[PDB]
Design a protein around this ligand. Structure first.
Ligand SMILES: CC(C)[C@H](Nc1ncnc2[nH]c(S(C)(=O)=O)cc12)c1ccc2c(c1)S(=O)(=O)CCC2
Length: 169
């Protein structure tokens, strides 16, 4: 079956959320698009990007190095479409701002705007974790910006519960 997301809670008409590991969701669902929380040189060294690369047995990193050699780095707030390998038809590599490294939080709107070129996506919460954005603010920007159908996988029950409570205020 196509895009068989299960156990998500619908927040708005086009935003759904689950307490789940995006790598395990991608292997089960085989979505048309999985979003990677990338950096501008597509170096998948840890966190979500490192885990998605490891699940492709490093094929995503080799493909990413070839893209950067020909095209140069991405900009913060930008994206590129590459192969999904065994995880999806396509991977949309999106660069959210890293607030812990001084990047502008306003670019989080530009980052989520890349999702609107794809009808259905499996995604992480952009700029959260060690990128330093406030995760409740990242969910609000996602809900206000994305107009296509996005399934957010957030792999922490404590954070998932705080995000659903904040949305339902
Ligand atoms: C907030 C946090 C619970 C979330 N983590 C995750 N969310 C969803 N699926 C996950 N799998 C794994 S794993 C066990 O394969 O490493 C982690 C994970 C997350 C969301 C966004 C970002 C990060 C982390 S980061 O990697 O710190 C920096 C880039 C932006």
């Amino acid at each position: 079956e196509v895009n068989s997301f299960s156990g998500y809670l619908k927040l708005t008409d086009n935003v759904y959320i689950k307490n789940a590991d995006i790598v395990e969701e991608a292997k089960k669902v085989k979505p048309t698009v999985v979003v990677n929380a990338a950096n501008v040189y597509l170096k998948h060294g840890g966190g979500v990007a490192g885990a998605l690369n490891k699940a492709t047995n490093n094929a995503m990193q080799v493909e990413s190095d070839d893209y950067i050699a020909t095209n140069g780095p991405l900009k913060v707030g930008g994206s590129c479409v590459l192969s999904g390998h065994n995880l999806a038809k396509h991977c949309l590599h999106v660069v959210g701002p890293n607030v812990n490294k001084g990047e502008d939080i306003q670019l989080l709107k530009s980052a989520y705007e890349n999702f609107n070129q794809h009808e259905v996506l499996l995604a992480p919460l952009l700029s959260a974790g060690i990128f330093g954005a406030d995760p409740i603010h990242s969910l609000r920007v996602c809900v206000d910006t994305v107009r296509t159908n996005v399934y957010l996988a957030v792999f922490d029950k404590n954070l998932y519960d705080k995000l659903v409570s904040s949305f339902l205020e």
